[PDB]
Protein: Beta-xylanase
Amino acid sequence: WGLNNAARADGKLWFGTAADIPGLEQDDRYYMKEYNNTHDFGGTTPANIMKFMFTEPEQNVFNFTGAQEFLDIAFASHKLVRCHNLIWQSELPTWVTNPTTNWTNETLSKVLQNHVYTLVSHFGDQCYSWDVVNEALSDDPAGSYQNNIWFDTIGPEYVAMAFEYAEKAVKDHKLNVKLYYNDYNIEYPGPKSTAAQNIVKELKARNIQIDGVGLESHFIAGETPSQATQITNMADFTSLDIDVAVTELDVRLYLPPNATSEAQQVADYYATVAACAATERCIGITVWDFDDTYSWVPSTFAGQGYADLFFQPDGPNTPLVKKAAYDGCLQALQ
Amino acid sequence: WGLNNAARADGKLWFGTAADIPGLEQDDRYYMKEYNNTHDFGGTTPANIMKFMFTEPEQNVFNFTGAQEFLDIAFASHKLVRCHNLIWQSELPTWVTNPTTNWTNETLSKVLQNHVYTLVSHFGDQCYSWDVVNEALSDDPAGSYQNNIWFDTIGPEYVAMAFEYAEKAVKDHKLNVKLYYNDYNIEYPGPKSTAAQNIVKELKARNIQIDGVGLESHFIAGETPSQATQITNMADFTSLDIDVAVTELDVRLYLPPNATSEAQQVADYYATVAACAATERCIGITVWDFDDTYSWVPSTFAGQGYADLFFQPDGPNTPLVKKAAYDGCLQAL
Ligand SMILES: OC[C@H]1O[C@@H](O[C@H]2[C@H](O)[C@@H](O)[C@H](O)O[C@@H]2CO)[C@H](O)[C@@H](O)[C@@H]1O
Ligand SMILES: *[C@@H]1O[C@H](CO)[C@@H](O)[C@H](O)[C@H]1NC(C)=O
Ligand SMILES: *[C@@H]1O[C@H](CO)[C@@H](O)[C@H](O)[C@H]1NC(C)=O
Ligand SMILES: *[C@@H]1O[C@H](CO)[C@@H](O)[C@H](O)[C@H]1NC(C)=O
Ligand SMILES: *[C@@H]1O[C@H](CO)[C@@H](O)[C@H](O)[C@H]1NC(C)=O
Ligand SMILES: *[C@@H]1O[C@H](CO)[C@@H](O)[C@H](O)[C@H]1NC(C)=O
Structure:
C-alpha cells in the first residue's frame, strides 16, 4: 500500500511524480523500480522533454520522439500524464529568443498558435492535461504580468490566446484533455494568487476553456504555507468552477539537514498533501521527482537540497532510502 | 565453524541467505567473500531473478540466463537453492498487468499453467524447492484470499492449479523438487496462519502435492513472536504431514539502534532459529540477505533498518562487521 493507492482511495486521480526521462534515470534500476511502482505513482509529468526547445527545436520543425518515449514508459505503468508545458519564458530555443529579424505581434502570435495547436493535436488523449501557460505572473510587483518574449511582443492577450488555440485543438480532435494554468507562489493568498484567479475569471468570461490551476508547491522547509493557508487558497480557486492540482511539490532544506529541519520537511509534505486531501476538487499531488540524486534543487538553489521523498546514500544505481517525508504524505492521505 | 555447520549438525538442510544476484552485490568483494562462505551459508534464495517479470518478459518467451547465473554461483559454494517464485501478485511484466486485451479465466489460467510448468520442468533438480505460490492470503480481513490478477480472474482455484501444474512437471520429468507455499504473518497462531493451514489441508484432501510451508519471518525487534509461540505454530503446520522452513528471516529496528533494541534483536533472531531447531520437520533457516548495506528494509520502511547479521560501517566495498545477532543464531543452534 503506497501513496497512489492511498490518494485514489481518497478520491484523487493520482499520487504522481515528475521524471527527467528520457535521461540518466533510465540507467538506474533502483530509481526505475520505484518509478514503475504503481502503489506509489499513478501519475507522472515529463520534467523536460515536452518543453518548447525540445519539441520545436527549429521554427516549424517538430520533434516528438523523446516525448513519445516518455509517454510509452508512462503508459506501461498505467500512469496518467500531465503534459508540461506549452508556453513559458524559459527553455526556449535560440530561434525564438534570438531571431535574426525581430518578432512582431503578428509573427510571434502565429508561432505561439502553431506550437500550441500542433502539440495538443499531435499527442491527443495521451495527455490527461496540458500546462498550457506556465508562470505568466510576476513576483514583483506580485500582481502583475511577467516580462518575457511572449508578453513583451503580444501583450497580456498571449495567455488567452494560448488557451483559445489549445481549446481549438481539443475541439477539432474531440479530445478529453484538460487545460491548466500552472504557477508558483500562488499556493497562499496574496496578490499573485489573486492575479491567477483573475486570469481564470477572465478566461471563463470569454468562454475560453480552462479546466484547472496547477499549484507548483516548490517550498522551503519552514516557509511552506500552513495546511490551513493552503486549504483556503485552494478553495478560492475551486470556487471558480475549476480543478486544482499540486503539480511540482518538493520541500527543500538548507544543507546539511538536521533533526529540526527534517522534522519541518515531514510537516510541510504532510500539510500540502493534507490540504489537497481536504479539497474535493484537488485532483492529485505530483512531486517534482522523488529521488534527491536527480532533483533539480541543488543546482538551482545553492546550498539547498534534500528536497525529495527518497535518496541514495551511495549515489546513482544504488539502493534507495525512503525518508520520513514519505510517511508524512501517506499519513496525510489516511 | 559457522551457522551452516551448526545447522547441519542439528539435522537441518542449511543455514541460508537470500541474495540479490545478479546485481550490485557481485561487485562487493567483502559481501561475496561472506556469501561464498559455506561455513555460514549452505542454502540460498534468489531475491529477484527468478520472478515472473524476469523469466517470462514476454508471453511464452522465457529468459533463464540470469537465473542460471544465480544457480551457477550458488553451485560453486555447494548451496541448496530455494527457487523463488512462480505465481505472485507483484513484479509482473506489463504484458500481464497492461494487456492489449482483457484476460479471461481461460487465457490467464493457461498463462499460469505454462509459466509454472515450464519453469519447474526447465530448472529440474537445480532447485531443492519452488515457492509455487507466494503470499496468496490477505491481511485484511486476515482469513481471506488476497485480491490479485490471478485470484480476481481465475478465482481461489488458482492456488490448487499452480501446485497441480507444478506436480505435473515433477512427475513428467521424475524430479525431486519440493513444492512450497510461502507467506508472511503466518509465523504465529491466528486467522492468516489458520488459512494457510487450510490451503494445505485442501490440497492434501484433493491429492495435490504440497511438501512444505515457508514462514517468511520478516519481524520487527520486540514484535517477533516468542520462541514458544513459533514452536506451536510450526507444529500446527508439520502435523499436516509437511515440512516447514524459515524462509526470509530478518529483524528490523527503528533507527538508530540502541542497547535495548539491539538486545531485542539478538533475542528475536535467537527465538526464531531456536524454534526451528526445536522443530523436527523445520528443514532450515534462511535470512533475507545478511548485510545491512543491501537489505530491502530502508527502501521500504522509513526510519528502519539494521535488520541483518552483518553490516559495513564504512560502506560498500569495505569489511563486514559481524553483529551480536550472529551469535544469537549460533547459540540457538
Ligand atoms: O520553478 C521551478 C521549475 O522547475 C522546472 O523543471 C526543470 C528545470 O526547468 C530544468 O532545468 C531541470 O534541468 O529539470 C527540472 C526538473 O528535472 C519546471 O518546468 C517549472 O514549471 C518550474 O518553474
Ligand atoms: C520500468 O518500466 C519501463 C517501461 O516498461 C521499462 O522500460 C523499465 O525497464 C522498467 N524498469 C524496472 C522495472 O526496473
Ligand atoms: C529529435 O529528438 C531526438 C531525441 O530527443 C534526437 O535524438 C534527435 O536528434 C532530434 N532531432 C531530429 C530527429 O531532427
Ligand atoms: C537546522 O538547520 C536550520 C537551517 O539551516 C538551522 O536554522 C538550525 O539552527 C539547524 N539546527 C541544528 C543544526 O541543530
Ligand atoms: C564467490 O563465488 C562466485 C562463484 O564462483 C565467484 O564468481 C566470486 O568471485 C566469488 N567471490 C569471492 C570469493 O570473493
Ligand atoms: C531504544 O529504541 C526503542 C525503539 O525506538 C525506544 O522505544 C527506546 O526508548 C530506545 N531506548 C533508549 C534510547 O535507551
About this structure: Chain B touches chain A at residues 24, 94, 97-98, 294, 298-303, 315-316 (CB under 8 Å). The CA atoms of residues 86 and 116 of chain B lie 6 Å apart. Residues A 29, 32-33, 36, 73, 76; B 94 surround 2-acetamido-2-deoxy-beta-D-glucopyranose (ligand 2) (CB under 6 Å).
